[PDB]
Amino acid sequence: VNGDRPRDLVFPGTAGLQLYQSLYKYSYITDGIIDAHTNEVISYAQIFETSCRLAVSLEKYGLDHNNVVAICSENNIHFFGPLIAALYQGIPMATSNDMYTEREMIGHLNISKPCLMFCSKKSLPFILKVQKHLDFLKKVIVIDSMYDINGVECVFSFVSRYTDHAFDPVKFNPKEFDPLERTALIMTSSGTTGLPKGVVISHRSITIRFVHSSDPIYGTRIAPDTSILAIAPFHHAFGLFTALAYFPVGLKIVMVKKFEGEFFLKTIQNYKIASIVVPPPIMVYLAKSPLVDEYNLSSLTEIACGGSPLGRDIADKVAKRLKVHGILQGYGLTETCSALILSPNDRMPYVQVKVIDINTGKALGPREKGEICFKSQMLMKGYHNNPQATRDALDKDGWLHTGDL
Amino acid sequence: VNGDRPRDLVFPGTAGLQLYQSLYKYSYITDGIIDAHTNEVISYAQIFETSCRLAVSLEKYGLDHNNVVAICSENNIHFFGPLIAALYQGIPMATSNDMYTEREMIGHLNISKPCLMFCSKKSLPFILKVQKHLDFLKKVIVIDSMYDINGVECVFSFVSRYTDHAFDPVKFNPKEFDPLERTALIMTSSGTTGLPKGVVISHRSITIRFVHSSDPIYGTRIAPDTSILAIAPFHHAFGLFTALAYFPVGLKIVMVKKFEGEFFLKTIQNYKIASIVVPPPIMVYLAKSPLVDEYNLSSLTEIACGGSPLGRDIADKVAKRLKVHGILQGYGLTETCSALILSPNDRELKKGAIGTPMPYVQFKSQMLMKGYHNNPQATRDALDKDGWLHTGDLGYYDED
Amino acid sequence: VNGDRPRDLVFPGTAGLQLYQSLYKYSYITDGIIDAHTNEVISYAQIFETSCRLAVSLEKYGLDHNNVVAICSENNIHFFGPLIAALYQGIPMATSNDMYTEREMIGHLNISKPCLMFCSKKSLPFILKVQKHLDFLKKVIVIDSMYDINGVECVFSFVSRYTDHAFDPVKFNPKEFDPLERTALIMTSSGTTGLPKGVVISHRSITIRFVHSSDPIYGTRIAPDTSILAIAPFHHAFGLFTALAYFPVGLKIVMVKKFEGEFFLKTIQNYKIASIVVPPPIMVYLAKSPLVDEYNLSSLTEIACGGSPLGRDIADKVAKRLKVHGILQGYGLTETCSALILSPMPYVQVKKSQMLMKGYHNNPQATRDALDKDGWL
Amino acid sequence: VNGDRPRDLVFPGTAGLQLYQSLYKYSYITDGIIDAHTNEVISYAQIFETSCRLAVSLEKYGLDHNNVVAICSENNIHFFGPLIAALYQGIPMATSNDMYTEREMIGHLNISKPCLMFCSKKSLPFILKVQKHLDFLKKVIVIDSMYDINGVECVFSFVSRYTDHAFDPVKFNPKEFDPLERTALIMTSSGTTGLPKGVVISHRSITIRFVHSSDPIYGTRIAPDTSILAIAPFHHAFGLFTALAYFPVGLKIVMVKKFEGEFFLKTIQNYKIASIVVPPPIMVYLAKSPLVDEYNLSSLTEIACGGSPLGRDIADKVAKRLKVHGILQGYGLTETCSALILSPNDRPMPYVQVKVIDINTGKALGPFKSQMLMKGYHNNPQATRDALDKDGWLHTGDLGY
C-alpha cells in the first residue's frame, strides 16, 4: 500500500524549472543530441537558448495557459525546443502522431484545439492541408529550418521577431504555477472505448517521472556526459518522457527515427552507447537475432523496457546475451506515464496501491490481496474535454481502479 | 555586486535531510571512506545506519536543540557518524581541534558548553583529563571502538541501548526545522582581537555550500563512485565543509591524517584519485618535488586549493606539471563555510582570486556566520546591517 | 602398501594451534573472506580476533572437552569464527545441515547432544523450533549479526560479556592436548546403512589434511594473497576441510552459497580466481554450457574434484576447455575425512591412515563393522 | 623485551631434516641455483640427489659427529652439496675463507682440525699446498668437477664409490639428534680479541633462522619459484645463513662471486630479481649514480642489508629511490648467526630476547638471549666463558639504543 521511499525528493516546483535548471547546469555538453541518420548535432546550450527565446516569443505573441499549442514531428533533434518552451510558460502542449490519417489528425486536433502548431519540414505539407479544415489553427512554425518556407515561419524567424541579439537565457525566468494543477501535456491514446479522447499530464507528473529516472535502483545509474539511444516515438508517453528525463540527468543523446533493423546496432556500437530504452518488439529482436554478434555491443551497461515482455524469458535472453545486469521488469504499464512498481536484478516512489474493501472505500493495509487500485501524483488528471471517461477511469476520491484482483 | 545564477537550486530543507537522502541514495557505494594509513573501510550504507541509529539514540537519551554536543577526533573515518546524526536531530555540534592544549581546550569547550562529547580512542585520555574541569560535560562516547573503554561507552554500546536488530534507517526521519535559524555547527577560531571566539553556522549555509560543490564551474565535476582525497582537519571549517560536501555527490573518499608527501602520492596513484582539495604547503611541495614523476598522477583530473592565497603563483606551475586544466581556487576569507568567492573554469585568470562571486553571495550571503556565539558586541563588530562584512580592506572589482 | 613420502611433515600439535598460527601469520590479508552476493568482507585479522575471543568466552562460559558445541548455517563468512575457536579449546564441534527437516535435525542433534548452538540469522527460527524439543540445548548464539535478536545473543554480545577492549589475540594461547585422541568434529552421514550415524574426526586428521593441501603434486600450488573459490556446503566434510585448508596457505576466499550459473563465471572472472574445488555436477556443467567462452577464465590455473567424475571422461574435456592441464581426482568417503587417492597420498596405507575416522559417536558399534580391529576398512 | 611471538613455530628436528624436506618439496624448481658469471644452472632435484648420495658416502667412508669436515670454495653453485650432506649426517662443517693466505688457512684449519676437505677446482692447488702442512687432512674432494683432477677425487667419483644407479633420495633418512647440542657449523670470526676463533653454530640456530626467513614482517614475503640474488661470501655467517634460508622457502637463486661493479647492476634486470641482500659497502655504492636504466624495480620488491649500515643514513635513500616499502636493515654479529633486531612495516626478533648491560654489576637498568646464539667458541673455553654469561646472556659491544 505505500511504495518505496524516494531516493531523490521530488522537485517542488514546475517541470519547466527543473528543465531550465538542467539546461543551465549542463550547458557545457556539446554533443547534446545527435541525429544518427544525418549526424546533425545540437548542444545543450543551443537548446537552452532556443527554448528561452521561444518562451519569450510565445508570450509576447500573446499566449497564456488558457491557450494550448501543438507539435507534430517524427523523431527530430528540434523536437525539444518548443516542448521545453511551452513548459517554461505553462502553456499546455499537445503532441501529435506524425503518421496519422488526415481524418485522425483532424479528430486528435479537435480535442485540444491548439492555436499554434510546431512541425517538421517533412510534416509541413500535411499540416497545412489539415489546417485548411480547422479554423482555430492560427499559426504554424517549422522547427528544423533556418529559413521560412513558402511564407510559413520557422522557429528562428519567429524568435527573431521577438528577441534581439543581446538576449541572455541566463537572465530568463520561467513562469511559476501550481505544478499539480497546470497541464504540461495533452497526449492522446485510444482506450477500450475506441474513441480518441486525450490525456492530461500535470507538471508534477513530470517532476516525479524525473525522480524515477534519477533512482539508482529503478532508474538509470549512468553518469553525465554519457551517450544513450532514443528510438520510441516522442509523441507517445514512452518516448516523450523517457527522452525528457535525459536532460535533467545530463545525458548525451543519439537519436533514431524508426527501427531500420540492424542500423540500430551500428549506432550502439559506434557511439559506445551505455543504456537503451526500448519497447518489447525491440527486446524480442534483441533476444532472437540473426547474428547480432557481428557488432560490438560491449558498451551496453543498462537495458530498459516499457510494454511488458509477458514471458518466454526474453528479459533473461537479453540479460544473458549481452553482459548486462537484470532488466527492469514487473507490472504492466499504462499510457498515463506508465512506470509503476517493479524489480531490478535482485529477486515505486510516490505511488500507492490499494487492496482492501471490494464494496467499501477506506483502508491502509496490504494484507489480504483482493482488488487493486492506484494513487499517485504521476497519474493522468483525467482526459481532456470529457469529464465522463475521467470518472470511469479514476474514482471519486483520487484512486484509480485498475482491473484485476 | 551579485553572484552567478545558481545552477542547482538550494535544497530548501535541512542540511541533515539532504545528507540523509544522500546516504540513502549512494548506499551502494562500498569503500565509502577509507583510512589510508590502515586500509580500514566504511561503506555509505554503514554510515547511513550508524548516523540514523545514533540520531535516534541521541534523541531518546534526551537531547534537543536547546542542547549542544561536541566532537574531538583527528581525521578519522568514524568522524561523520556523530556529526551527521546531530544534523539529523538539530542538535548543535561543536568540533574541536584534536591538537589543543588543556587550557585551549577548556576554553573552547567553555564557549559552547556541550553536555555530551564524542571522541577518538586517541583523544580519550585528554578528554577525560579535560572533563574533570567541566561540570557540564556529562557523557563521553568513543567513536572508533567496538568495545567500551574502562567504563566509557562507545557508539556501538550507546546505540544498542536504544535501538534493536530490527532498526531500518530507511524508515527513519530526520527532524524538520527552519534551516535558516537552526545552528548546525559552532566552530572555533581566533585572530582579530585575540581571545578565542565561537562561530555560528546555520544549516542553510551548509545547504548552499552543497550547491557550490555541485556547481559545474566553481565546483567538482566528477562522477559518483570515483575516489577523492581528503586531508584537511575535519575540525576546521575548510576540512569539515569540504568533506561534508563529498557525500551529496556520491564520491568515494580516501582519507589521510598526517602529510608526509611520499605516501600521499603512493595513495593517489594506487587509489586512482581524481580530485584533490589541499592547503598551500602541500601545493608548493607538489610543484617542487622530484618524486612527483616517479608516480602516476595521471588520474588527477581536478585540483583545488583553499585556506590561503598561495601567495605568488604556484598554481600555474602545478597545473602544468600534473597536466590539469589549471587549478583555480578562491579566498575562503572567514570561518563562514570556508569557500565564498572562487576562480573560474572558463575565464581570464588575472591575478588574485577575484573572479566573480559564488551563487547566493553578494558580503551578504545566507552562507555567512549567523554571528558568533554568545558574544553580541563583536558579532556586531563584524556583521551588521544588512548583514554585511567588510574586513579585508581592499576595493577592486572590475566587471566582474 | 604405502603412500608418498610426505614433503611436509604433519604438524605434531593440535589443529587449532596450526590454525591459530596461520591466522596470526597472515592477518595482513585484508580480503580474507568475501560474500560474493553481498561484498561483505572479513579479514584474516578479524577471524583471528573473533576466534580468539570466542574461544576465551567459551572457556569462561564454562565449556571443556567433556562438552560438545554445534553449528548450523548455510555457507556464511562468519562460519569459521565459532569453528576455529572450538578447535582452539578442544571443544568438539558438530556441523549441521542447514537444509534439514525438523525431524532430521532433531535426530542429528540427538546423536552428539551439544549443549550450545551457533547459527545464522537464517537458521535461527528453525533452530529455536528444534530447541523446543531438546532439553540439552541450553544456549543459542547468532553469528552473522552485530545485534541480539529477540533475546537470542549474537557472538559480539557473548564475547563482550567475557572480554574487554584490551584483549590481544597475540597474547592468547590455544589449549594443548594429544591431537590424536581429541575429537575435533562430529560430522553426520548415512553410509554403513541408511540411518543417521556420526563420524568422529580427530585433530590429527585435520593436521594431515593440511599436509595434503600443502603437497606440491596433490595439493594447490597457489601463493598467498590470491583469490580461490568456495562453493561446497561447510557442513559436509568436503566443503569444511577444503575451506579449513585455505587458511594455513593464506588464500583469499571468495565464497558462494548456492550453485550457481553465470554468476559463478562472473565471479571467477571479476575476482580473478586461480583455483576451484568442485563437486561432479559443476564439472559436468562447466564441460557443457557455452557461456564459458564470453567470460574471462584466464586466471583459472588449478581445478579439483571430489565424488568420482570418471564416468564419461568429463574431466578430460574440462581440462582442455579452460587452459588448465591436469585435474585433481578426489576420493570421497565422509568417513575418510576427505580424499585418500589422487593423481598413494601421504600418511595413508591401503589393502590405513591417521586421517581416518576414529569411529562413530557414543554407542555405535557399527564402528566395529566399518573399521576393523587393526585400523583398516 | 621478548621480541615477537613466532608467526611460524620453529621446526623441532635437525637443520638437515628441514633442508631435506625442503629439497624434496621444491624438487620441481629447475632454475634452482644459477651462476651469474657462467649461466651454469643446478636444479633443486640435482641438490636433493647430490646431498643424499654424498651423505651416504660420507657415512660409508666412515665419518660421524666426532669427525669434522671442511669446505673451501668461492661462491659456487656446488657449494651446497657437501654442506647439506654434512647436515644430514650431523657431521660438523667448517667453512674456510677462499681468499686466506697460507698462514691464515693453516691456522683456521688448525682450529677445527677437519679430516676431510671439499674445495673448488680453483681452490685445489692452494688446498694441496696447505694440506702438505697438516697431518689430519686425509682426503680432499673437488666439488665442481665431473672428472678427477690428478688423482684428487671429485664428488662424483666419491659418491659412485659408495652408491649405485638405483639410489633414491626419497628413501633416504637423515640422522636424528638433539638439534640443540649438535654443532652444525664451526665458522671463524675476526674476534678483535687478538686471535681468530671458531664459532660453534647449533642446528637449532639454523631452524630458527629459517623461522625468521619465513616471518612476513621481518623476513621475505616473496613467493616460491622467484629469483633472488646471492652475493655475500658463503663462508661468512651472512652469506651462508641467508643463502641457506632460501631453500626452505623455495627461492630461485642467481649467484655472483666476487665484489661487484656493474656486473651486479646488469643481473637484477636480466634475471628479474625480486629481493637483494647486500653488505654495507654495496649499499653505499647503491648511493651512487649508475643509472643504466634497466626496469629493475619492476621486480625489486624487497632489499636487505647487514654488517654496519646507516652511517650517513643511506637507508631512506635507497628505499624511496628504487621504490621499496622502506628497506630491511639488520643488526647481528656472527656470534648471533644472523640478525637479532630488525625493522617492520610501520614507521627484536622471535626466539630472541634483549636487555641492558649495567656496567658495574646491575643486570637490570631500564628504558641477547636467543636459542640462535653461538654455543661458544671451539676448543677455547675462556673466550666462551667471557662472551656468554652464566645465565646465557651475551654482551653486544656497545650500550644504547
Numbering used by the authors:
A (entry chain B): 7 to 353, 364 to 421
B (entry chain H): 7 to 368, 390 to 427
C (entry chain A): 7 to 349, 363 to 370, 391 to 416
D (entry chain G): 7 to 353, 363 to 382, 390 to 423
How is this structure described in the published paper?
At the core of this natural phenomenon lies a fundamental process of energy transduction by luciferase enzymes that convert the chemical energy stored within the ground-state substrate (luciferin) to an excited, emissive state of the product (oxyluciferin) by a spin-forbidden process. Although beetle luciferase systems share identical substrates and chemical reaction sequence, they emit a range of different colors from yellow green (λmax ≈ 560 nm), which is typical for common firefly species, such as the North American firefly Photinus pyralis (GPp) and the Japanese firefly Luciola cruciata (GLc), to orange and even red (λmax = 590–623 nm) from certain click beetles and railroad worms. Biochemical and structural analyses of the two luciferases, combined with computational modeling, provide the best insight yet into the relationship between the structure and color of light emitted by beetle luciferases.
Unlike previously reported luciferases that are exclusively monomeric, in the P3121 crystal form, REPh exists as tetramer, although in the P1 crystal form it is an octamer in the asymmetric unit. The N-terminal domains in the octamer core structure are assembled as a tetramer of dimers and packed over dimer and tetramer interfaces, and the C-terminal domains point outward. This assembly accounts for the structural flexibility and increased thermal motion of the C-terminal domains which is apparent from the residual electron density. Only molecules C and F of the P1 crystal had sufficient quality in the electron density to trace the complete loop. In the structure of REPh, each dimer within the octamer is stabilized by multiple hydrogen bonds between amino acid residue R11 from one of the monomers and Y26, Y30, and N179 from the other monomers, which extend over a C2 axis across the dimer interface.
